């Protein structure tokens, strides 16, 4: 309903990446609701249009699956919802209240995008018989689609959580979804506790947790950073589940399981979190498969965990020793000014892969 | 008569390089190298293979040397390395019409390979000196030059593969009355004790560290033989290659540990774990040397990157990684800034999985050198 014209226009622009510190500025006394509106009514169409161009480059057999068609229809509707605001007055508190409601509607509409897109890959696999693990097009696309999705969810969450007028705010000292004083070990313990509750139900034994902090500059100081705790939680929950599953499965006896050891290091540039297990490990040749969408989980926990780490210029790396165990390391930027969004952009480089 | 490969001359070298460059290098498995020792009737076979294969490998990489930017190619050190490769190619071409049935041909061939090995002994630092000549003349940081980085990885991996073929022939067939390591098949130890190679590399790095520093970290080794916990870990490998990797990693771990503990006489130890799985032999070296931020790891594997006691020559760590890759292994670094660094050597546990990784001169390679 005009959609191809809007997609074409907004696709020409590059997404504009923000630092964690710029997110904080948008949610502070340095900015207001009008600033967030004028930014987002341009930025959300650019990001929606850029990924919608890439969806339309998928092989026709993937594009025509019911679930991919459903996801494409949501993106089209969300783009048109934001177009209603392009000529509205930012000075008018009605415009701003209507915009917040439109973003809440979009967030609800897109809530199940991750499993719905995964269902479309399975529909493709179960119809045509091509293993999506081995299809490099689908793997390349899903990394960029899911990173795009994380970036759009971050923009919408920041606006709706800050400008809600949220009656009783969950975590009242957060700036939207950002904790400017995130205690990293508390997020580690919370992710471990949730993984331990699941592991106790299904195995009747879980490895213990051991945490060590190294604050290079200030030995005694409990480590804090500016981060989105839900993103950190998602990564650590996934890593704990895998380390606990490997530890339990590789041990004859559930009586004396080796613990999972976590080290949190704060350097000048990096906040590093290493999770070490004695779960028997993975041969080097098979590490790549663990980050493959829908490999032998719902098929996406570990690759999406790695996208959350990449999103603010971090990484998630696995280093295994077959016959012994596995180290997983989350690398985050220590400084909010270094934590800049990593966004896929629709360009010649992207086009080539498809 | 005046056939292309007859009465070879310096003047003819471009034509010979063109001819041999049309063939692909033929990769051998560690298992095939073991077979080619098992009888001295294998000497004729080694000769007939090597008088074709060494010209092919020489010619393939010589094509890429000639694609270097003019200002790198013209350096005296690069010209020197290219002149050695040309002479070595001509030396082997003298054998193309000679009779393998004549024991004189075989003894002359072994002498010619020993001459070549001696001539090429300093190729690694000479090539590096040419890149430095380029850097120090033009002020282009070779770390950031993707052409030079691409070339050096392929050049040094080619060099490793040539040295392996020459070592296998000369150490099996030279007929040393009482040989140094009598249980080896050329340079291959079919019962390589990995911990002993770790201890030898540690001892040599500690000798160097004790020269410059008042203290050096101790060594701790742990073994996990998954299938047989009581069995000391052994594998089929080339122990000199494993030594070169472990020497480089010990030097770096010792340098980091000392520099982060400036006036300490009691240092955190360097811990090594050797794990044997069904597919992988993994060696992890762990230090408490204060670590490297993630953004700077890529630089450590860049040719001619520097931050001379245990300082680098610009190639130790990337060439260590080429030794791991040469038989389908790898060398990976993972650091934790403010704590320390883990380096992991991954080797194939099975001699049949250990196949030479060789660069081949093709259109794909040619493209990389194009503006
Ligand atoms: C696409 S996904 O995100 O949905 N997906 C990825 C996660 C996967 O589950 C797992 C879990 C654990 C393990 C595992 C083993 C182990 O299990 N070895 C035995 C065979 C494992 C496969 C096997 C093969 O594939 O052939 C080859 C060795 N050992 O160490 C780990 C390990 C892994 C991670 Cl990632 C970790 O963080 C910590 C660990 O200790 C492997 C796989 C299901 C789902
Ligand atoms: C191209 S080469 O192969 O010739 N070669 C050059 C010379 C050598 O450099 C080295 C050695 C050690 C270290 C080092 C530090 C450290 O020293 N941090 C301090 C930073 C401060 C300036 C920083 C920068 O900005 O570059 C970068 C180091 N901490 O952990 C390690 C470490 C490294 C390796 Cl590889 C390892 O195996 C074990 C280790 O503990 C860094 C660099 C290798 C690479």
Domain boundaries, chain A: 3-175, 176-342
Between chains, do B275 and A323 touch, taking CB under 8 Å as contact? yes
Between chains, do B293 and A270 touch, taking CB under 8 Å as contact? yes
Helix or strand (DSSP H, E) at B246: helix B239-259
- Residue B25, judged by CB atoms within 10 A of its CB (0-12, 13-18, 19+), counts as buried
Q: How far apart are CA B43 and CA B49, in angstroms?
A: 10
Q: How far apart are CA B251 and CA B270, in angstroms?
A: 11
Question: Which structure tokens are listed for B35?
Answer: 């077979």
- Residue A244 in contact with residue A260, Cβ under 8 Å? yes
Helix or strand (DSSP H, E) at B364: helix B363-368
Q: How far apart are CA A18 and CA A22, in angstroms?
A: 6
Exactly one of A238, A251, A261, A274 is catalytic; which is it? A238
Using CB atoms, which residue from B273, B279, B330 is nearest to A322? B279
Count CB atoms within 10 A of the CB of residue A129: 7
Strands A209-215 and B189-193, bridge-based pairing = unpaired
- Please list the residues that pair with A350 across neighbouring strands: none
Question: Taking a contact as any Cβ pair under 8 Å apart, which residues of chain A between 215 and 274 contact chain B?
Answer: 215-217, 263, 265-270, 272, 274
Sign of the CA dihedral running B242, B245, B248, B252: negative
- Mind giving me the DSSP string for B161-204? HHHHHHHHHHHHHS--SS-SSTTSBTTBEEEEEHHHHHHHHHHH
Strands A270-276 and A325-333, bridge-based pairing = antiparallel
Contacts A323 to B, Cβ<8 Å: 224-227, 275-278, 280, 282
- Residue B51 in contact with residue B96, Cβ under 8 Å? yes
Local structure of A92: helix, strand or coil: coil
- Residue B266 in contact with residue B315, Cβ under 8 Å? no
Count CB atoms within 10 A of the CB of residue A28: 11
- Residue A319 in contact with residue A329, Cβ under 8 Å? yes
Between chains, do B227 and A270 touch, taking CB under 8 Å as contact? no
Q: How far apart are CA B84 and CA B123, in angstroms?
A: 9
Question: Taking a contact as any Cβ pair under 8 Å apart, which residues of chain A between 207 and 226 contact chain B?
Answer: 214-217
Q: Give residue A295 CA to ligand 1 midpoint distance, Å.
A: 10
Measured torsion, CA atoms of residues B93, B99, B101, B106, in degrees rounded to the nearest 10: -30
Which residues, in sequence order, are CB contacts of A232 under 8 Å at separation 6+? A182, A184, A187, A191, A308, A330, A332
Count CB atoms within 10 A of the CB of residue B47: 19
Sign of the CA dihedral running B140, B143, B149, B153: positive
Task: Please indicate whether residue A120, judged by its CB atom, sits closer than 6 Å to ligand 1.
Answer: no
B280 and chain A in contact, CB less than 8 A: yes
Count CB atoms within 10 A of the CB of residue A274: 22
Q: How far apart are CA A344 and CA A15, in angstroms?
A: 8
The conformational region for residue A268 under phi > 0 = left, psi -120 to 50 = alpha, else beta, is alpha
Known binding residue A120? Answer is no
Count CB atoms within 10 A of the CB of residue B123: 18
Which residues, in sequence order, are CB contacts of A47 under 8 Å at separation 6+? A15, A148, A151, A152, A155, A343
- Residue A293 in contact with residue A305, Cβ under 8 Å? no
Would you give the DSSP letter of residue A324? T
Burial B276-307, CB ≥16 within 10 A → b, else e:
bbebbbbbbbbbbbbbbbbeeeeebbbbbbee
Q: Give residue B252 CA to ligand 2 midpoint distance, Å.
A: 6
Count CB atoms within 10 A of the CB of residue B249: 28
Q: How far apart are CA B127 and CA B82, in angstroms?
A: 9
Experimental method: X-ray
Task: Please indicate whether residue A245, judged by its CB atom, sits closer than 6 Å to ligand 1.
Answer: yes
- Residue A329 in contact with residue B334, Cβ under 8 Å? yes
Q: How far apart are CA A117 and CA A138, in angstroms?
A: 11
Local structure of B238: helix, strand or coil: coil
Contacts B290 to A, Cβ<8 Å: 216
- Residue B323, judged by CB atoms within 10 A of its CB (0-12, 13-18, 19+), counts as buried
Contacts A217 to B, Cβ<8 Å: 338
- Mind giving me the DSSP string for B83-100? HHHHHHHHHHHTTTTS-T
Q: Give residue A313 CA to ligand 2 midpoint distance, Å.
A: 22
Measured torsion, CA atoms of residues B243, B245, B248, B249, in degrees rounded to the nearest 10: -110
How far B226 CA sits from the closest chain A CA (Å)?
5
Q: How far apart are CA B309 and CA B216, in angstroms?
A: 13
Question: Which of A207, A242, A297 is the pocket-test mutation for ligand 1 (most atoms within 8 Å of CB)?
Answer: A242
Q: Give residue A248 CA to ligand 1 midpoint distance, Å.
A: 12
Instruction: Give whole-number Cα distances, B110 to A96, B39, B57, B85, in Å.
Output: 85, 17, 18, 17
Q: How far apart are CA B371 and CA B351, in angstroms?
A: 41
- Residue A289 in contact with residue A283, Cβ under 8 Å? no
Q: How far apart are CA A141 and CA A117, in angstroms?
A: 11
- Residue A319 in contact with residue A243, Cβ under 8 Å? no
End-to-end C-alpha distance for chain A, whole angstroms: 27
The conformational region for residue A205 under phi > 0 = left, psi -120 to 50 = alpha, else beta, is beta
Residue with tokens 């930017």: B69
B297 and chain A in contact, CB less than 8 A: no
Using CB atoms, which residue from B273, B277, B294 is nearest to A322? B277
End-to-end C-alpha distance for chain B, whole angstroms: 42
Contacts B343 to A, Cβ<8 Å: none
Q: How far apart are CA A103 and CA A41, in angstroms?
A: 10
Q: How far apart are CA B330 and CA B346, in angstroms?
A: 5
- Mind giving me the DSSP string for B99-154? -TTSHHHHHHHHHHHHHHHHHTTTHHHHHHHHHHHHHHHH---GGG-HHHHHHHHH
Alpha helix stretches (DSSP H) within chain A: 3-11, 20-26, 33-55, 60-63, 66-83, 93-109, 113-128, 136-163, 184-203, 229-250, 287-290, 301-311, 348-353
Residue with tokens 């004396």: A256
**CA–centroid distance for B205 within its chain:** 19
Burial A283-303, CB ≥16 within 10 A → b, else e:
bbeeeeebbbbbbeeebbbbb
Q: How far apart are CA A305 and CA A279, in angstroms?
A: 20
Burial B135-173, CB ≥16 within 10 A → b, else e:
beeeeeebbebebbbebbbbbbbbbbbbbbbbbbbbbbb
Which residues, in sequence order, are CB contacts of A253 under 8 Å at separation 6+? none
- Please list the residues that pair with A175 across neighbouring strands: A178
Q: How far apart are CA B180 and CA B189, in angstroms?
A: 12
């Amino acid at each position: 309903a005009g959609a191809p014209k809007y997609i074409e226009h907004f696709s020409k622009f590059s997404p504009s990446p923000l630092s964690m510190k710029q997110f904080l500025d948008f949610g502070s006394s340095n900015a207001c609701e009008k600033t967030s509106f004028t930014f987002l009514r341009q930025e959300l169409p650019v990001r929606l249009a850029n990924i919608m161009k890439e969806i339309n480059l998928l092989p026709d057999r993937v594009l025509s699956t019911p679930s991919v068609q459903l996801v494409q229809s949501w993106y089209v509707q969300s783009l048109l919802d934001i177009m209603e605001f392009l000529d509205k007055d930012p000075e008018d508190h009605r415009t701003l209240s209507q915009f917040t409601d439109a973003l809440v509607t979009i967030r609800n509409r897109h809530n199940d995008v991750v499993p719905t897109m995964a269902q479309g890959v399975l529909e493709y696999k179960d119809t045509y018989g091509d293993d999506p693990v081995s299809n490099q097009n689908i793997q390349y696309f899903l990394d960029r689609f899911y990173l795009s999705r994380i970036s759009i969810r971050m923009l919408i969450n920041q606006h709706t959580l800050i400008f809600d007028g949220s009656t009783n705010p969950a975590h009242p000292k957060h700036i939207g979804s950002i904790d400017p004083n995130c205690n990293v070990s508390e997020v580690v313990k919370d992710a471990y506790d949730m993984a331990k509750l699941l592991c106790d139900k299904y195995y009747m034994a879980s490895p213990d947790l051991e945490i060590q902090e190294i604050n290079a500059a200030n030995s005694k100081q409990p480590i804090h950073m500016v981060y989105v705790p839900s993103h950190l939680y998602h990564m650590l929950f996934e890593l704990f589940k895998n380390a606990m599953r490997a530890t339990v499965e590789s041990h004859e006896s559930s009586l004396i399981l080796p613990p999972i050891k976590v080290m949190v290091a704060l350097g000048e540039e990096d906040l590093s979190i290493k999770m070490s297990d004695r779960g028997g490990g993975v041969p080097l040749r098979k590490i790549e498969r663990l980050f493959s969408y829908m490999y032998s989980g719902f098929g996406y926990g570990l690759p999406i965990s790695r996208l959350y780490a990449k999103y603010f210029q971090g990484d998630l790396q696995l280093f295994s020793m077959e016959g012994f165990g596995t180290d997983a390391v989350i690398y985050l930027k220590a400084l909010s000014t270094d934590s800049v969004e990593r966004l896929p952009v629709y360009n010649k480089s992207a086009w080539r892969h498809y």
